[PDB]
Structure 1
């Protein structure tokens, strides 16, 4: 589906935000299912319901508060999406990813994505935290892509590379930080595969996905990462393994990682 937002639309929203808060975050965090508590660590917090922000889509899924919260996390200025958007809600990817481009226009340089996923790797257990090393974009194979349509050169190039999407340096930082935390369970890492949803997978589908090389499965994140890389944002993320085919722990982990982010 071709994008319906104009560059000016993104700019209008960014301007509105800049004129409503003194906060100037360099980092943006998208909180997935059951990860909304991450905004509780914020100091000097300022909240905006998605409904009050011009052009913003709305979270219709339970567990997704639908609020944009600016604040200081571990001495770092951040902006968090307390809840996100999903294709299964009826949103084309250009709407699901709208905030990512707005963040770039606010001066954000790093995007942290989080989600709740089903574990396909047999070595994963419920409660595991998997650093996303790579992804498999199934909807993208059929053309469902947030970048579909005329390319906005002011954001990025026509054919963006995706092989280096998840920042290697941050991957290293995450592991070092996990060790400083003294966690008994090792920090997992792997490939996240996105499918449309909303129904849960069949066994045949799960076997298929695992054999495709996927370690975790979900219905989000990938489109946001694609748009982030297209506009030049540094990206890193984690999947909270909510079941085998921790949230508070991940929030703590992300808070410590703020200190490791460059700039």
Structure 2
């Protein structure tokens, strides 16, 4: 018995956004949705109307799916995501990603607020993730495989499309701001990491730590949906500074890089258009 939500959604969306085929799908984490406000002919569907979507329970995540145009590019934007720490398993974002795939999207632009594991990169920086290290228990596709979307086994090689990443770099040069690339390691949460664990993440070879990304991305790769991810650093990981960690700190510190983020995105979109 496999979920059929992705299919339902496709029909439900057609009722609100008829004759529309998006190219890029976006996931806007905490306080990053200020982008969805600039979508042309934007139509908003609440997750409550889309079976399978992550009905929000966290701040900085609304619970809407915005469809429209950005830089003359058809786009499906997710204001708010779903996390592992919500207690619904690594599959929380899957049907959602699977919807993007059916909608016709050709790429997933995954954004998220994170912490830095490199003293060199501080709060307010943007990082284009180039690979990840899962620390959450298990993976999204564990269980019976849904032949409809993907295969039993799949490679995560070049998960974070190297080619699209290259365009991200150009866009960054052009806009006068650094775009460092790093390995993202996922933490289950909902509590923050311990200083001890952060050092362990540094030793393991990580550059950025967050509580999401992984679920979505692995699901995306499984159904063969190209991925691109950019984290908005909001502080140094626990123990690398003197700053106290709070969700309030996260939401606030995501405003320093907000402008560069929108330029990076709107720039990327313009080159791919």
TM above 0.5, one fold? yes
How far 1:97 moved relative to its partner?
2.3
Which one of 45, 62, 73 corresponds to residue 42 of structure 2?
45
Equivalent residue in structure 1 for 2:236, among 239, 244, 263:
244
Structure 2 residue aligned with 1:166, among 149, 152, 160? 160
**1:14/1:103 contact within 8 Å kept:** no
TM-score normalized with structure 2 length: 0.89
Count of residues paired in the alignment: 253
- 2:201 is matched with 209
Q: Determine the C-alpha separation between the residues in 2 that align with 1:218 and 1:88.
A: 12
1:33-76 deviation line (CA, Å, top 9, x unaligned):
22111101211100011112233231110011111000111111
Query: Structure 1's 232 and 260: CA in aligned 2 closer, same or farther, altered over 3 A?
Result: farther
Structure 1 unaligned regions, length at least 5: none
* 1:254 corresponds to: 265
Contact 1:170–1:260 (CA under 8 A) maintained in structure 2: no
Question: Secondary structure of the equivalent of 1:15?
Answer: helix
Is 1:60 aligned to 2:57, yes or no? Answer: yes
Q: Is the 8 A contact 2:184 2:208 kept in 1?
A: yes
1:220 pairs, out of 212, 218, 222, with: 212
- 1:87-126, aligned counterparts within 5 Å? 87-126=84-123
Give the Cα–Cα distance (whole angstroms) in 2 for the partners of residues 201 and 95 of structure 1: 21
For the residues of structure 2 that align with 1:14 and 1:167, how far apart are their CA atoms? 26
Structure 1 counterpart SS, 2:16: coil
Which ranges in structure 2 are unaligned for 5 or more consecutive residues?
238-256
Aligned-CA RMSD value? 1.4
Whether the 8 Å CA contact 2:83–2:92 is kept in 1: the answer is no
- The equivalent of 2:7 in structure 1 is 11
Instruction: For residue 256 of structure 1, give the secondary structure of its aligned residue in structure 2.
Output: helix
Q: Name the TM-score, length of structure 1 as normaliser.
A: 0.92
CA deviation digits over 1:122-153, x for unaligned, max 9?
A: 211111100011100112xx4x2110111112
The Cα shift of 1:9 comes to 2.8
